[PDB]
Write a protein that binds this ligand. Structure first.
Ligand SMILES: CCCCCCCCCCCCCC(=O)SCCNC(=O)CCNC(=O)[C@H](O)C(C)(C)COP(=O)(O)OP(=O)(O)OC[C@H]1O[C@@H](n2cnc3c(N)ncnc32)[C@H](O)[C@@H]1OP(=O)(O)O
Ligand SMILES: Cc1nn(C)c(C)c1NS(=O)(=O)c1c(Cl)cc(-c2ccc(N3CCNCC3)nc2)cc1Cl
Length: 411
């Protein structure tokens, strides 16, 4: 039994989810007028805070909370170390609602103890294609197509309770209050990902890794030398040789994205994403924001030939604190962001991703098996990890789909 999630407009079981045929809301339809205007009650030693995201010092406080209390691997070897410039980038996209950033502070000292954030996103989340088929088959098309239009919803992320406050039922309260602030602005759906199993995922994809610096990865125990490498004189030599990469990209035509590129990238990106059942729709401003290069944060390259952007790829940076080594403070990880290829094979576009990432000193390239990410796994030498990233909707009945039907990257 889930004493909190049992009370919420989400499907409660797998056998419920594997049964839903059409997209649509779970809940009673409500109105902003229905929604309490007062923040949810919390204990008197605490207060609600709305951090200002254009203030270095609020940003810093959130940074400090996540640096010390955000996601850890299960072995307590690594913890995410999202930088401050990263957090402002992710929390302040175009038309962000400050009010959707929810913080709990100790009244006395104003020590930050909990956080959750929401950001707007325009998401295509109607009935998946295979299920539109079975609908036509059955004369049920109009019902299946009812919620096809892109919805302006909320993207939830960065939920985090201080280590000292764990298992005190605080996280439900943060979620109820975030829900409140979002329902207040006439939004009734949310989307979120988590490494854990909650009721109830609509897709689930394995994690994948590609060693850029195998010596460090073994030293910090991110990676092991596989038994098959012992049959060699010099295990680390063979490993290193095995993952080596060219020093410069292979595609002539390749450079960083510039502002003048935005409409072409938007265009090639949307054509690509539109073939997925679940995926975002981006304005010019959203493409500028989520893809223009920003130092230490997001790195984006286009293939231009004949003054035409035929292809682009993007990645972003999240260091993890190495918790249990002493020699290395940090794992320097590149995450495959969005991309599109029209003129060249995808494995060929992404090789140049590895090449750049490695040349800029990243230790590893990470990804989930969404988009067409599966298409380059073997030839670029990615390995599956032990994670599962799960994708969820709040207040939205949706069929179980394959992770390769998802085109939403969550930071
Ligand atoms: C319309 C808009 C709607 C807006 C809202 C949309 C929904 C958003 C939903 C959230 C999307 C966030 C996506 C991300 O950011 S995922 C990243 C999550 N963050 C971390 O893992 C950081 C390290 N961990 C922690 O800070 C805490 O352990 C957290 C905060 C995760 C739980 O704190 P704590 O350990 O002190 O526990 P509790 O006693 O306070 O609370 C216990 C209840 O919490 C349920 N629980 C445990 N983990 C998660 C989890 N990751 N998502 C949702 N629920 C979770 C759990 O099943 C139990 O419920 P029930 O089993 O009793 O029913
Ligand atoms: C190096 C390292 N550092 N950390 C902190 C870990 C867990 C690893 N090892 S890992 O590489 O193998 C790995 C990686 Cl990168 C990531 C995730 C993961 C979990 C949750 C999540 N959501 C993303 C959206 N917001 C909510 C959280 N995304 C990703 C799990 C694994 Cl297990």
């Amino acid at each position: 039994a889930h004493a909190f999630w049992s009370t919420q407009p989400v499907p409660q079981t797998e056998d419920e989810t594997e049964k839903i045929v059409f997209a649509g809301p779970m809940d009673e339809p409500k109105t902003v007028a229905d929604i309490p205007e007062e923040p949810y009650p919390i204990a008197s030693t605490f207060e609600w805070w709305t951090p200002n995201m254009e203030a270095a010092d609020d940003i810093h406080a959130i940074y400090e909370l996540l640096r010390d209390n955000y996601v850890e691997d299960d072995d307590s070897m690594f913890r995410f170390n999202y930088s401050e410039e990263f957090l402002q980038w992710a929390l302040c996209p175009p038309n962000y609602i400050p009010d959707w950033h929810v913080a709990v502070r100790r009244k006395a000292d104003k020590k930050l103890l909990a956080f959750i954030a929401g950001v707007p996103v325009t998401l295509r989340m109607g009935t998946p294609k295979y299920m539109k088929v079975k609908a036509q088959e059955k004369g049920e098309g109009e019902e299946a197509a009812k919620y096809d239009e892109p919805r302006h919803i909320c993207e939830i992320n960065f939920l985090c309770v201080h280590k000292q406050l764990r298992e005190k039922r605080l996280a439900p309260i943060l979620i109820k209050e975030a829900t409140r602030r979002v329902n207040r602005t006439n939004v009734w759906q949310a989307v979120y990902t988590a490494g854990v199993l909650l009721p109830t995922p609509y897709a689930s994809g394995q994690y994948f890794h590609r060693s850029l610096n195998p010596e460090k990865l073994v030293e910090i125990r991110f990676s092991g030398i596989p038994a098959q490498y012992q049959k060699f004189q010099n295990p680390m030599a063979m490993l290193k040789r095995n993952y080596q990469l060219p020093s410069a990209p292979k595609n002539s035509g390749l450079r960083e994205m510039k502002p003048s590129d935005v409409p072409q990238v938007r265009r090639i990106l949307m054509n690509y994403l539109d073939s997925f059942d679940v995926g975002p729709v981006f304005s010019d401003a959203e493409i500028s924001h989520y893809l223009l290069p920003r130092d230490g944060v997001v790195f984006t390259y286009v293939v231009e030939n004949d003054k035409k952007v035929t292809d682009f790829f993007s990645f972003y940076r999240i260091p993890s604190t190495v918790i249990g080594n002493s020699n290395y403070n940090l794992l320097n990880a590149a995450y495959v962001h969005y991309y599109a290829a029209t003129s060249i094979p995808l494995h060929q576009l992404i090789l140049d991703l590895l090449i750049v990432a490695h040349s800029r000193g990243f230790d590893v390239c990470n990804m989930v098996e969404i988009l067409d990410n599966r298409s380059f796994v073997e030839q670029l030498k990615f390995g599956a990890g032990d994670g599962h990233l799960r994708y969820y909707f709040y207040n939205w009945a949706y069929p179980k789909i394959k992770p390769s039907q998802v085109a939403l990257v969550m930071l």
